[PDB]
Amino acid sequence: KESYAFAVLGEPRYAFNFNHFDYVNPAAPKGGQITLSALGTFDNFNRYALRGNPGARTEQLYDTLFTTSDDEPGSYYPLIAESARYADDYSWVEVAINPRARFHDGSPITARDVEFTFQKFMTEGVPQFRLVYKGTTVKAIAPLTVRIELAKPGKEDMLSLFSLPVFPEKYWKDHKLSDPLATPPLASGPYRVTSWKMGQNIVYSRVKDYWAANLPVNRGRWNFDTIRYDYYLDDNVAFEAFKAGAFDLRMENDAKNWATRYTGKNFDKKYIIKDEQKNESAQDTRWLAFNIQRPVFSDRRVREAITLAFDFEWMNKALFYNAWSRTNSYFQNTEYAARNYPDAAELVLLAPMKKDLPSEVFTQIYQPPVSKGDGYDRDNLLKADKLLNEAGWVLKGQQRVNATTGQPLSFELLLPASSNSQWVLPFQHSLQRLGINMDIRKVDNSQITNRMRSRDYDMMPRVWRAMPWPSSDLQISWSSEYINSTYNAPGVQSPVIDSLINQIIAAQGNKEKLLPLGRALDRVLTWNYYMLPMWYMAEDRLAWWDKFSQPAVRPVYSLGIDTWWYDVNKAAKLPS
């Protein structure tokens, strides 16, 4: 009925005596600069717009009603809100707003601003928002009390509204949410944009009189006076800039960099620290999306064949120092991954749709193709050939052509110019040995963003962000009605997916019913070969210039850079 803390599943870790998180130093000193890289470019400051390339960190301009801890999958703690009263089914909540809550101009954050914000997303926001919150109302029932009512139960959908940025009506009444912003909006978080150069840098300054600096969720965080993002057109130029000291911190995503290029005077003299930690929670995964709305990838057999042409064991051994693990799940390294045979609860979910399922969903555990790693896997390439031929794509000369029409089998791989892409030519070569032509097109960050959003590609790389439980967000990425959300990478509209996700969205907060539902969905998504699995590693590889100190404990779901601070003694030992 009344609480200070919420959890999507289970109970919140910091439900009692909450003074600060475990993964901060509450005494961390304020001051100093951290300089970071970003790849590509940006052209505006509105993260929530229908178009444009928003600046680094422009999704954290605003405080929210509650904020999530970084050492838990989905637990919410007071930020702008102090507390909430609620129905046992979470279908309604009355949120008490902290009377100290202020925007950067020193004006109050009120229940009206929250009501205004919800209506703003509903009428000018991304089209998925009004679809998800279609039966929902958000009303200021008192100056500092906002009442949220859902039309149907959705504990996660309710808690997700706690993460909505709270906009100041006084500013946003004059700007459409759907339009990009050439200058930063009036905001409220612990850092404000203070200068920038369009497409090149953004500087954030710590708000020194931030109203919430001493809330428990904020203690020991937001330590740096300045956070600077410099933009680099590709990762090789950024990595060389890092080694020369042009920015302070690097997340290393290239296996060859890590294995062979962390060398030179700066490492010998220990000006740069390098660190590698096993990461035991849910994992981001890389994939290549097949646009299944294009005729070239409409047939599951052709998608299966092209997958067989991707020689991961060769790439890992010859190119990547054995660093990577093969992606094999949409719930990678969680309990929701379909890594065993369906149990009885899964078959109750699955058997009704047997006619619309690959039969392997019932008989086999999904395993991406394995080669011996020698190059030229003959079993896998012969199977690819067999499947292509069945789908009507047959060799005429050295080229695969449609058996009916004589059209060559050809597609374009769309790539960001900014990425390393060492796997691309070997994949192209493998495809060429099957008679498949893959054109490579590298484009800038603004073209890539636009085309990724509109699905104007045959194939492109996509990251599937870690999903620690089967979230109601899955509908946005996979359900037919959300096809134009920008998150449905293959273009799939399936009644099987829809039905399993409708079940999931009706079981929000219920781990017992979500376990077999997540596994079931995982079998459907994987066995349809909607995307070509690439790789991940359960290990964070970080390097930084030795000017920082860190809390003893690192959070489970993030690197915790926002808990670091500038260490004047370590920094004094580095050259200019």
Binding site: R51, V126, Q128, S485
Partner: peptide, 7 residues
């Protein structure tokens, strides 16, 4: 993501 478009 319910509030913004991909990246």
């Amino acid at each position: 993501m319910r509030t913004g478009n991909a990246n």
